[PDB]
A paper describes a structure:
The risk of developing such life-threatening reactions is increased particularly for HLA-B*58:01 positive individuals. Taken together, this data demonstrates that allopurinol, and to a lesser extent oxypurinol, may enable the loading of unconventional peptides that are normally suboptimal in forming stable peptide-HLA-B*58:01 complexes.
To test this possibility, we selected a known peptide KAGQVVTIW that has been identified by mass spectrometry analysis of HLA Class-I peptide pools eluted from purified HLA-B*58:01 of a 721.221 cell line. The endogenously bound HLA-B*58:01 peptide is from a self-protein lamin A/C, and contains the preferred anchor residues at P2 (Ala, Tyr, Ser) and P9 (Trp, Phe). The PΩ-Trp residue of both peptides occupy their respective F-pocket of HLA-B*58:01, which is typical of canonical peptide binding behavior. The indole ring of P9-Trp also forms hydrogen bond with Asn77 on α1 helix directly, and interacts with Tyr74 on α1 helix and Ser116 on β sheet via one water molecule. The most notable difference in binding interactions between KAGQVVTIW and KAGQVVTI occur in the middle part of peptides, where the P4, P5 and P6 residues help to support the protein-peptide complex stability by means of secondary anchor bonding. The only interactions among this region are P4-Gln with Glu63, P5-Val with Arg97, and P6-Val with Lys146 mediated via three water molecules separately. The data showed the average melting temperature (Tm) is 71 °C for HLA-B*58:01-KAGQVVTIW and 65 °C for allopurinol-KAGQVVTI-HLA-B*58:01 and oxypurinol-KAGQVVTI-HLA-B*58:01.
Author numbering:
A (entry chain A): 1 to 277
B (entry chain C): 1 to 9
C (entry chain B): 1 to 99
């Protein structure tokens, strides 16, 4: 299948409570593999998946040095953002950044990403050309001008097309037994009366990996989009995910409802119904 | 492996 | 500028009385990142609770999984209690072994 690598940085100021906290996590697809937290007793980039543990001390030392340098950069960026938005030094603010690379099923680069936010709103994004910028506001246009003058896009492009792809491919090979294994959902429908004339049908998907899934209810073969309660996909804690979709249906009409499940681990989409007794 | 490009705002 | 948490409380596997399992409280969709999450057993805070490393979704909202090992029984109740800047008081969501 297709695969991605993504890093997520969060920098959170806290005036009066020390320097801003910096947390970074790295993922391959829906598998976290590294973390870094500037509030740890001894901040270090640390493994979070079995297949990264084999990397040697040069890897861990180099990733730690880079994350410490990044924490310093993002502390500076929080100070700069206060200037750009005319904000006081008393408030708590957050910079977030996500970046990485996507590969298609053939292992080829599909696209790169590198986007940042300030206080949970888009700030600046590298465009898909890996060459030009989209700034969300007049503050981010200042950053854009600085980055254009310094040819930052070219440096990010070189990472995203080069080391990002090369290291993702390495991880996919070293973690192949898990990263390249889809676990299909285990599915079933439950039934719970709500009253004498309506009942909830809940279609469950459990134990699946990766997280992407489609669960839909049809009534007489028509999708019930506007009448379905669909919970957010949620982690089980064993690498797998869970989801459910529910509809409230007239009693006696349960057999007119079908649940449809699509997942990369399934050879063909599944159709399920409530099976009494 | 993380990117190392320094991106000061 | 602030987003309140969504909360789901559930188990790692379908609950079976007397069988060890994990109780999960997944908090998501929130901003800013500071959040207080306790897991409760019959109203009292469970001491041994771990959580995932802070990450966020494509809309910049944060998510965290809090979890603890537990053995459900017929009569014990469990819950997750969440506080966040967007909440005037903590929100308690009881575990429903069918949700």
């Amino acid at each position: 299948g297709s695969h991605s690598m993504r890093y997520f940085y969060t920098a959170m100021s806290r005036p009066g409570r020390g320097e801003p906290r910096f947390i970074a996590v790295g993922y391959v697809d829906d598998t976290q593999f590294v973390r870094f937290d500037s509030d740890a007793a001894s901040p270090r980039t640390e493994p979070r998946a079995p297949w990264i543990e084999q990397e040697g001390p040069e890897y861990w030392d180099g990733e730690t040095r880079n994350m410490k340098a990044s924490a310093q950069t993002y502390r500076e960026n929080l100070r700069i953002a206060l200037r750009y938005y005319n904000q006081s030094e008393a408030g708590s603010h957050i910079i977030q950044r996500m970046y990485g690379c996507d590969l298609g099923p053939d292992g080829r680069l599909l696209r790169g990403h590198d986007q940042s936010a300030y206080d949970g709103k888009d700030y600046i994004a590298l465009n898909e050309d890996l060459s030009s910028w989209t700034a969300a506001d007049t503050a981010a246009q200042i950053t854009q001008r600085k980055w254009e003058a310094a040819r930052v896009a070219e440096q990010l492009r070189a990472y995203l097309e080069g080391l990002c792809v090369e290291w993702l491919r390495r991880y996919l090979e070293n973690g192949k037994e898990t990263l390249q294994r889809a676990d299909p959902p285990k599915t079933h429908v439950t039934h719970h009366p709500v009253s004498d004339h309506e009942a909830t049908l809940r279609c469950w998907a459990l134990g699946f990996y990766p997280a992407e899934i489609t669960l839909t209810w049809q009534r007489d073969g028509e999708d019930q989009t506007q009448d379905t309660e669909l919970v957010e996909t949620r982690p089980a804690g064993d690498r797998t995910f869970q989801k459910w979709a529910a509809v409230v249906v007239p009693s006696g009409e349960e057999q007119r409802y079908t649940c449809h499940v699509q997942h990369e681990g399934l050879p063909k989409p599944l159709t399920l119904r409530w099976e009494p007794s | 492996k993380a990117g190392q490009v320094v991106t000061i705002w | 500028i602030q987003r309140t948490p969504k909360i789901q409380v559930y188990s790692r596997h379908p609950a079976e009385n007397g069988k060890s399992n994990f109780l999960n409280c997944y908090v998501s969709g929130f901003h800013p990142s500071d959040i207080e999450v306790d897991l409760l057993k019959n109203g009292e805070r469970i001491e041994k609770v771990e959580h995932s490393d802070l990450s966020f979704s494509k809309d910049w909202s944060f998510y965290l999984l809090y979890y603890t090992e537990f053995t459900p029984t017929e009569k014990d109740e469990y819950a997750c209690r969440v506080n966040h800047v967007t909440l005037s008081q903590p929100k308690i969501v009881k575990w429903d072994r069918d949700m």
